Design a protein around this motif. Sequence first.
Motif, PDB file in Angstrom:
ATOM      1  N   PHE A 152      -3.082 -10.617   2.920  1.00 19.23           N
ATOM      2  CA  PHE A 152      -2.145  -9.596   2.501  1.00 19.23           C
ATOM      3  C   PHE A 152      -1.477 -10.156   1.244  1.00 19.23           C
ATOM      4  CE2 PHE A 152       0.272  -6.112   2.335  1.00 19.23           C
ATOM      5  CZ  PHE A 152       1.120  -5.750   3.371  1.00 19.23           C
ATOM      6  N   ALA A 153      -1.782  -9.570   0.086  1.00 19.15           N
ATOM      7  CA  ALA A 153      -1.242 -10.029  -1.202  1.00 19.15           C
ATOM      8  C   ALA A 153       0.215  -9.669  -1.560  1.00 19.15           C
ATOM      9  CB  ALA A 153      -2.160  -9.561  -2.310  1.00 19.15           C
ATOM     10  N   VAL A 154       1.102  -9.665  -0.569  1.00 18.64           N
ATOM     11  CA  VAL A 154       2.518  -9.364  -0.811  1.00 18.64           C
ATOM     12  C   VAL A 154       3.263 -10.700  -1.000  1.00 18.64           C
ATOM     13  CG1 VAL A 154       3.330  -9.462   1.570  1.00 18.64           C
ATOM     14  CG2 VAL A 154       4.431  -7.927  -0.019  1.00 18.64           C
ATOM     15  N   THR A 168       9.008   1.440  -3.417  1.00 16.00           N
ATOM     16  CA  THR A 168       8.670   1.497  -2.006  1.00 16.00           C
ATOM     17  C   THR A 168       8.389   0.114  -1.415  1.00 16.00           C
ATOM     18  OG1 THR A 168       7.338   2.786  -0.396  1.00 16.00           O
ATOM     19  CG2 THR A 168       6.151   1.801  -2.282  1.00 16.00           C
ATOM     20  N   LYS A 170       7.431   0.092   2.060  1.00 14.24           N
ATOM     21  CA  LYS A 170       6.776   0.458   3.305  1.00 14.24           C
ATOM     22  C   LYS A 170       5.579  -0.442   3.653  1.00 14.24           C
ATOM     23  CE  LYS A 170       5.970   4.914   5.647  1.00 14.24           C
ATOM     24  NZ  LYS A 170       4.477   4.947   5.802  1.00 14.24           N
ATOM     25  N   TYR A 171       5.525  -0.864   4.912  1.00 19.40           N
ATOM     26  CA  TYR A 171       4.457  -1.710   5.427  1.00 19.40           C
ATOM     27  C   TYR A 171       4.488  -3.120   4.844  1.00 19.40           C
ATOM     28  CZ  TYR A 171       2.413   2.898   6.589  1.00 19.40           C
ATOM     29  OH  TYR A 171       2.190   4.163   7.055  1.00 19.40           O
ATOM     30  N   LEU A 172       5.414  -3.394   3.922  1.00 16.63           N
ATOM     31  CA  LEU A 172       5.468  -4.718   3.288  1.00 16.63           C
ATOM     32  C   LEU A 172       6.170  -5.831   4.081  1.00 16.63           C
ATOM     33  CD1 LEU A 172       5.695  -3.875  -0.504  1.00 16.63           C
ATOM     34  CD2 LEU A 172       3.781  -3.920   1.116  1.00 16.63           C
TER      35      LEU A 172
ATOM     36  N   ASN B  23      -0.023   4.724   0.727  1.00 18.98           N
ATOM     37  CA  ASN B  23       1.372   4.734   0.343  1.00 18.98           C
ATOM     38  C   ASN B  23       1.567   4.093  -1.028  1.00 18.98           C
ATOM     39  OD1 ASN B  23       4.292   5.173   1.167  1.00 18.98           O
ATOM     40  ND2 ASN B  23       4.288   2.991   0.638  1.00 18.98           N
ATOM     41  N   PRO B 150      -0.294  -4.870  -3.327  1.00 21.90           N
ATOM     42  CA  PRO B 150      -0.354  -6.112  -2.561  1.00 21.90           C
ATOM     43  C   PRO B 150      -1.453  -5.803  -1.535  1.00 21.90           C
ATOM     44  CG  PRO B 150       1.520  -4.801  -1.896  1.00 21.90           C
ATOM     45  CD  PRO B 150       1.027  -4.234  -3.195  1.00 21.90           C
ATOM     46  N   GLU B 151      -2.694  -5.930  -1.988  1.00 19.35           N
ATOM     47  CA  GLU B 151      -3.872  -5.655  -1.193  1.00 19.35           C
ATOM     48  C   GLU B 151      -3.949  -6.341   0.184  1.00 19.35           C
ATOM     49  OE1 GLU B 151      -7.947  -4.975  -2.895  1.00 19.35           O
ATOM     50  OE2 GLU B 151      -8.436  -6.918  -1.946  1.00 19.35           O
ATOM     51  N   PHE B 152      -4.236  -5.539   1.216  1.00 14.88           N
ATOM     52  CA  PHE B 152      -4.393  -6.029   2.588  1.00 14.88           C
ATOM     53  C   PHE B 152      -5.897  -6.046   2.821  1.00 14.88           C
ATOM     54  CE2 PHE B 152      -3.440  -7.578   6.407  1.00 14.88           C
ATOM     55  CZ  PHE B 152      -2.739  -6.834   7.363  1.00 14.88           C
TER      56      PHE B 152
END
Lengths: 189, 189
Positions: A152-154, A168, A170-172, B23, B150-152
């Motif tokens: 996950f590239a966050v 946004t 969201k989901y991060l 999203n 931020p690719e998952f």
Amino acid sequence: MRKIGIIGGTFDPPHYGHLLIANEVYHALNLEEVWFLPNQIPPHKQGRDITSVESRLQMLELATEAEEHFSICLEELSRKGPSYTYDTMLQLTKKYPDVQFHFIIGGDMVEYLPKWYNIEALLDLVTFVGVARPGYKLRTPYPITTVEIPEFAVSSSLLRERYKEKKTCKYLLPEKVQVYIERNGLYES
Amino acid sequence: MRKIGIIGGTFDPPHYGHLLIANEVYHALNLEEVWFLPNQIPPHKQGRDITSVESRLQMLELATEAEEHFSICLEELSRKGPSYTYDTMLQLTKKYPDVQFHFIIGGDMVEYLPKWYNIEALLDLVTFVGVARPGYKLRTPYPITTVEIPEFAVSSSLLRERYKEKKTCKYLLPEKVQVYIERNGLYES
Ligand SMILES: [Co+2]
Ligand SMILES: [Co+2]
């Protein structure tokens, strides 16, 4: 030897990238626990308007309370900064002699390990674990253990930027953490 | 025109990979809706037990519920046998000539574009959107809109595999979807 994974970072704020990696390696390598090691704030660094280590700790607590196997390690916060990983692992190594520590890093920090202070001695103290996506191979001259992960590239910096730019999230990162951020107006506003 | 996003796939099962992508692009390109377009899976002759379009549709509905901006497009499930993206878009274009669709794909899928059925014609029907990690460039001879995300790196196939070998699935897909999978024993028993 007890196997305990260590994940370092600012956790400003913590996010699913931190939890995803902890859970994956925890399973792939059959570890006992994974410890989240917050970094001490660097000198001159944001001696301006930024998150207090106290808030980082709270969010980090919110994010890991549901996991008995994930705990916080205040070792770097115990000393004034900056924090060198070597010195830090030296201490955990004397406090916990029964443990074989696994320092976990994202796939892309791997190319910068040469620039880490005392990396050769550090590789004696702990065993590095590099996280990579399926099929992608990590290249480095240092011995590292690779664990294929649906990465996950966050990152915390992307998240900070986004809270200010009012984008946004969201989901991060964990909802409980998001609520904390808004209630206290961190980064945002 | 009213811009709509399209994400195709097996959704066997649907996962956070899909939601994050929808999203992220829904916000980046200011779409007013993103459509999840499930593919029709044909019976494996050498015999292979595959999920019924029924339960996959329920999983898709479970992960899509809470989002007003997320809907299911049943165009491919309406034909007998799998159909090419070109054909499907020809129909969506003529059925909604007021919309300019944005076919969303993973940055790693980009290089395989030249081998797509009727891609020259398809480029004129829809607008491709390539999703990638920040900084990464999307090398391709086609006019693609790139969006940093931020690719998952999670996939349906990686999931079917975790469930079979009883590996962990945490943070990989929605709660409700796992609940439905566990019950009906979708990839285990
Ligand atoms: Co929004
Ligand atoms: Co487990």
